[PDB]
């Protein structure tokens, strides 16, 4: 199933108080009106890729979803983040957990911390080893799909775990449909009111109107013509053309000669009509110093 | 626990200790004469008692004497690309001392491993625990070592007779990250009483300036620490003692 991500998933990108101002910031936000995947909890908890940041949304009435598991293999071979909420305690670990064949909750350890009607929206991202988790709870009266409207996301948790996570799975309480979207490096124009709260945001890479909006850093565009960007056709393939060189150049012999000349009569051999690889020069560890001054060594092939 | 540790980890599994919820002095490290190299360009070591950082990580590892020059931004070498890569915009101060009387044995200390073979340069602050056998030749390597199949980890023979270029050196990289989050690792400077309705040279969590500190009605959310205006100047600050 698929759903349109109307306006949800906009968050405070940093923690500097701003008020009554339109500020542009480029960060990992989910695109407006993009396709988000829809999961059900009737009669379904697969693993999804944690590529660059995930936005999660859940509609809840009886507290079914109680935790999440993030990692790469999820088989006690590596450290995997497990967050669980038992009704009084929130527990976050990255321990060498022994996961079940199908992880659920019924009715080398490095870290441990212990403390429809309700829409709970979250965003999970990993920046420089820091796991940022933002969340917000709101009352809703809607059973079919996710509601239409705007809601700014406030940050809650920042954990310095320093773990590479690429896949994640949720934890459900078994005796509740949810939505998952992906973040992208987009530039958003955020509006701070007089209370300092973000009341609106424009994904200005959505359409020409939003492009004009963020080029003019305003939510209102007057009548007229405005230059917004520059289009340029991108190349589709690379075309390398070099002479049909037929002779590898005797670079080995100037290193493997019987005797070398002295410094007072150093020999100057011109190298011409040659194919120069220099890879055997890089990989060989017999050299004491390898110092290139004009051109970088790796950019010679 | 990080400077006078019993044993240091090798560069293939270098320890990354997060230092938080304490007072960082660095005064005993400046007066210590047993240290060999103490180099850093981003931040000066003398202006740390008044300045405060958000967080700091200690990257400790044992490396050879002649390889201590490779742990620096802009350097190129075997260790700088296969075991410990430092970014070009790295801020922080690195310390290194000799361990010729600790990590040495009669027959040789072979408990320190370093990566020698890798098909790609390491990322900044990347920890490569990959044990897969490197494939040097054109034939595929199915985990069996031999021709064109080498183990990327190698060891040195540490003896008290070896030269200063082959002696083991304990290197600790103190990398400071400064974010807008509330700081926790500040210098050893005592605080004083606060005065209002008069402009004074203030210094809150390393952020210094001059001006009047007046009461505010701006509702700062939990982890708000500093306020920035259109001119990127400080507009409001949160006292670390009183919320």
């Amino acid at each position, epitope marked *: 199933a698929y759903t349109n991500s109307f306006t949800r998933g906009v968050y405070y990108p940093d923690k500097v108080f701003r008020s009554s101002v339109l500020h542009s910031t480029q960060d990992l936000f989910l695109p407006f009106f993009s396709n988000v995947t829809w999961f059900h909890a009737i009669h379904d908890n697969p693993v999804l890729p944690f590529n660059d940041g995930v936005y999660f949304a859940s509609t809840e009435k009886s507290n079914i979803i109680r935790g999440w598991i993030f990692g790469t293999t999820l088989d006690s071979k590596t450290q995997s983040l497990l967050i669980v909420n038992n009704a009084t305690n929130v527990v976050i670990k990255v321990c060498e957990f022994q996961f079940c064949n199908d992880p659920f909750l019924g009715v080398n350890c490095t870290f441990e911390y212990v403390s429809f009607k309700n829409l709970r929206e979250f965003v999970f991202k990993n920046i420089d080893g820091y796991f940022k988790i933002y969340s917000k709870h709101t009352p809703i009266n809607l059973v079919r799909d996710l509601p239409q409207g705007f809601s700014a996301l406030e940050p809650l948790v920042d954990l310095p775990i320093g773990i590479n996570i690429t896949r994640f799975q949720t934890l459900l309480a078994l005796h509740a449909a949810y939505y998952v979207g992906y973040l992208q490096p987009r530039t958003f124009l955020l509006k701070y009111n007089e209370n300092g709260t973000i009341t609106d945001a424009v994904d200005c890479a959505l359409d020409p109107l939003s492009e004009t909006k963020c080029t003019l850093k305003s939510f209102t565009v007057e009548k007229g013509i405005y230059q917004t960007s520059n289009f340029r056709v991108q190349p589709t393939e690379s075309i390398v053309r070099f002479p049909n060189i037929t002779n590898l150049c005797p670079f080995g012999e100037v290193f493997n000669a019987t005797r070398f000349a002295s410094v007072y009569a150093w020999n100057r051999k011109r190298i011409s009509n040659c194919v120069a690889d220099y890879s055997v020069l890089y990989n060989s560890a017999s050299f004491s110093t390898f110092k290139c001054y004009g051109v970088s060594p790796t950019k010679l092939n | 626990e990080v400077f006078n540790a019993t044993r240091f980890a090798s560069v293939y599994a270098w320890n990354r200790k997060r230092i938080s919820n304490c007072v960082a002095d660095y005064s005993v490290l400046y007066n210590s004469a047993s240290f060999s190299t103490f180099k850093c360009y981003g931040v000066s070591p003398t202006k740390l008692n008044d300045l405060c950082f958000t967080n700091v990580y200690a990257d400790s590892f044992v490396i050879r004497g002649d390889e201590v020059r490779q742990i620096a931004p802009g350097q190129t070498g075997k260790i700088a690309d296969y075991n410990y890569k430092l970014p070009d915009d790295f801020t922080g101060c690195v310390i290194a001392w000799n361990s010729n009387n600790l990590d040495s044995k009669v027959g*040789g200390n072979y408990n320190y491993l370093y990566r020698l073979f890798r098909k790609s340069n390491l990322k900044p602050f990347e920890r490569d625990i990959s044990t897969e056998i490197y494939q*040097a030749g054109s034939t595929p390597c199915n985990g069996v*070592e031999g021709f064109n199949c080498y183990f990327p980890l190698q060891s040195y*023979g540490f003896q008290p007779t070896n030269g200063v270029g082959y002696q083991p050196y304990r290197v600790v990289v103190l990398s400071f990250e400064l974010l807008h989050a509330p700081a926790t690792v500040c210098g050893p400077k005592k605080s004083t009483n606060l005065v209002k309705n008069k402009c004074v040279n203030f210094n809150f969590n390393g952020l210094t300036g001059t001006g009047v500190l007046t009461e505010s009605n701006k509702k700062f959310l939990p982890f708000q620490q500093f306020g920035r205006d259109i001119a990127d100047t400080t507009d409001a600050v949160r006292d670390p003692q009183t919320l």
Partner: antibody, heavy 128, light 108 residues
């Protein structure tokens, strides 16, 4: 100044096991894969296996796969080779051997090249 | 796995050759053939390695040659001390240091 010493002569019964030590000095111990060769009295040489003192890598001959076991102690720079399920034709002289170059031969076809340093003697005799 | 003559005789001062024939997959595709000398009851000594390269200290009288699928040891100026067994060596595809029938060199 490369010095190599092995254990003494040993006698074993058929079906038992034998453990020989191989203690080296004067060079970087882990920088040389240790090869092993056996020779029956009055016969030719017979290579048996090699061990990597670094990371503990080892590989045996398909002739002896399952009967011979190696370990090594880098703290004292020694190798140890064990022959299990001994029979009559294992009465022979055994050496370890040091490979020629360093394991930095991008080409240095190591450690499959050869043996420059051969050890003194270990004679294992297996008779009822 | 390799074949070499069992015993060949020579005279003092003579230049003598010792053959060792392999296949195209072990000696014919690799320039990695060698020659070892061992005296009776003695430890073997590597005389020729990596085709014709010699370890330090070995006399120049021992040289090597390779032709198609054949290795050849050459000894210039045969002496009485040259009496020993000579083995050819070549990589064969798997573990490991292999040999020949053994060439016992005798002087007349």
């Amino acid at each position: 100044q490369v010095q190599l010493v092995q254990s003494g002569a040993e006698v074993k019964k058929p079906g038992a096991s034998v453990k020989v030590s191989c203690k080296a000095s004067g060079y970087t111990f882990t920088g040389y894969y240790m090869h092993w060769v056996r020779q029956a009295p009055g016969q030719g040489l017979e290579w048996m296996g090699w061990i990597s003192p670094v990371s503990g890598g080892t590989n045996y001959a398909q002739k002896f796969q399952g009967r011979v076991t190696m370990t090594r102690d880098t703290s004292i720079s020694t190798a140890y080779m064990e022959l299990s399920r001994l029979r009559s034709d294992d009465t022979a002289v055994y050496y370890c051997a040091r490979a020629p170059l360093f394991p930095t031969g991008v080409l240095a076809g190591d450690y499959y090249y050869y043996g420059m340093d051969v050890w003194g003697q270990g004679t294992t005799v297996t008779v009822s | 796995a390799l074949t070499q003559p069992a015993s060949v005789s020579g005279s003092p001062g003579q230049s003598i050759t010792i053959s060792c024939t392999g296949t195209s997959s072990d000696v014919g595709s690799y320039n990695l053939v060698s020659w070892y000398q061992q005296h009776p009851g003695k430890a073997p000594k590597l005389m020729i390695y990596e085709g014709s390269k010699r370890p330090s200290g070995v006399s120049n009288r021992f040289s090597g040659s390779k032709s198609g699928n054949t290795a050849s040891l050459t000894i210039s100026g045969l002496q009485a001390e040259d009496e020993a067994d000579y083995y050819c060596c070549s990589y064969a595809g798997s573990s490991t240091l292999v040999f020949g029938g053994g060439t016992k060199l005798t002087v007349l």
